[PDB]
Amino acid sequence: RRFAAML
Amino acid sequence: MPFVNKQFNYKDPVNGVDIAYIKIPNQMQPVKAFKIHNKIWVIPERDTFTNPEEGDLPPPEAKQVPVSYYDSTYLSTDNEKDNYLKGVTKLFERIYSTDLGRMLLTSIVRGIPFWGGSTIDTELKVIDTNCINVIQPDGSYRSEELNLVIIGPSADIIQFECKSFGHEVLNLTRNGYGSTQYIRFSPDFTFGFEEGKFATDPAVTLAHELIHAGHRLYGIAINPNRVFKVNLEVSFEELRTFGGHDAKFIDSLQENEFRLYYYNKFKDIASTLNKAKSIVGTASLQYMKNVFKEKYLLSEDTSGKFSVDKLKFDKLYKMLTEIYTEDNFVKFFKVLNRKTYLNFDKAVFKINIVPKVNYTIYDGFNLRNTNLAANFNGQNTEINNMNFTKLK
Ligand code: NI
Ligand SMILES: [Zn+2]
């Protein structure tokens, strides 16, 4: 998963 | 292998062996899939199966570029699917062409999900969600083991991720068993990162996912609920997947507690192999024992009994958890890349890596013998401006 998915 | 054993075209005739129609444990209509390598399949379709809550193509409160991106039209024609297929193929070859990638891919092929789907503890049975149903000439299906499926994204085209089917009573990705990994991914988009002038090499983005899949295939993935404050909370799993600079954020004590933990889980598997008396399927209990001996690098004594070798375990474990990392892949590819995981994409670009004048197995975007060779010009979306289309 891309960092975007931590947000 | 040259890795991928042939140049598939999406229109190539099915042969029921490496080009066929399949089902993925859901009823769904069959879709055309391609085995590009032992245990590895590619389904050039938008993923509207693997999730019940995800069987459509943009929701009301959807995020904007460059976090999410929507286009229900993407991957709906045979030309697109053929292109998708050839893109994914290229990236596998690009990854495989590196020593690091060669190893990761080998660990993945070897990483067959454990046969722990039986009620009797002396019986080895495959878990059905680790297979696909492959259509045969009479319209009958045959179940086939696989480790990895590359599939088109769902509604959100750039929501790349590893997904796998669960178990009523087993945590396959976390108990050392592993399960078949479905990677939502697209070769036709990438991201501009800080600082977003420079585009991420799609080979790096796939490798990232392959590393997650590595973890999950060996049942050593870390619960996403396990996070570390970073400043912001990020999962243990991602920080270690990226590696490099980010390693600093990982508590070494927990790191060691998981290691001992999974050494034990491998003992369980060894112990189970020792107690095995029967198997389901067609070869062979002895053959499956050897398969798993190799996966978990178990040691076999003269009486044929299995045990975990501490050295071999430490090497295997280290390989999967801190050698296969995004940061390390960057080094091998010698491309430009974010130096940390905590880096916001600043843009999204439509690309096309299939033409060899656009992107090569060896240089990615930064083709040698072109103006794009130096200073990562190939990754510079302002300089290599015909290879990138900024989205919305
Ligand atoms: Ni720092
Ligand atoms: Zn990730």
Residue numbers in the entry:
A (entry chain C): 1 to 7
B (entry chain A): 1 to 26, 29 to 59, 61 to 198, 211 to 246, 256 to 306, 308 to 417
Give the article text.
The holotoxin is composed of a 100 kDa heavy chain (HC) subunit and a 50 kDa light chain (LC) subunit; these two components are tethered by a disulfide bridge. The LC (BoNT/LC) is a zinc (Zn)(II) metalloprotease that is released from the holotoxin into the neuronal cytosol. Once inside the neuronal cytosol, the LC cleaves specific peptide bonds (depending on the serotype) of proteins composing the neuronal SNARE complex: the synaptosomal-associated protein of 25 kDa (SNAP-25), the vesicle-associated membrane protein (VAMP), also referred to as synaptobrevin, and syntaxin. Of the seven BoNT serotype LCs, the BoNT serotype A LC (BoNT/A LC) possesses the longest duration of action in the neuronal cytosol.
One of the PLMs, JTH-NB72-39, was co-crystallized in complex with the BoNT/A LC protease, confirming the interactions aimed by our design strategy while revealing new, unforeseen inhibitor:enzyme contacts that will preface future studies to design more potent PLM and SMNPI inhibitors. We obtained a co-crystal structure of this complex at 2.4 Å resolution. Significant electron density for the PLM emerged next to the catalytic Zn(II) around the binding cleft defined by loops 70, 250 and 370 in the LC protease. The carbonyl oxygen of the JTH-NB72-39 P1 residue (Arg) coordinates the enzyme's catalytic Zn(II) ion (distance is 2.4 Å) and also engages in a hydrogen bond with the hydroxyl group of residue Tyr 366 (which is known to directly stabilize the tetrahedral intermediate formed during SNAP-25 catalysis), while the amino terminal group of the P1 Arg also coordinates the enzyme's catalytic Zn(II). Specifically, and in contrast to I1, the P1 Arg of the inhibitor engages, via a salt bridge, with the LC's Glu 164 residue while it also shares a hydrogen bond with the carbonyl oxygen of the LC's Cys 165 residue. The amide nitrogen of the JTH-NB72-39 P2′ Phe residue engages in a water mediated interaction with the guanidinium group of BoNT/A LC residue Arg 363. In the present co-crystal structure, Aib engages in favorable intermolecular contacts (via its hydrophobic gem-dimethyl groups) with the side-chain of BoNT/A LC residue Val 70, and an intramolecular, stabilizing, hydrogen bond with the amide nitrogen of its P6′ Leu (not shown). However, the backbone of JTH-NB72-39 abruptly contracts forming a sharp bend at the P3′ position which results from the distinct conformational effects of the Aib residue. The higher Ki value for JTH-NB72-39 compared to I1 is, in part, due to fewer favorable hydrophobic contacts provided by the PLM's Phe component in the P2′ position versus the larger P2′ Trp of I1.
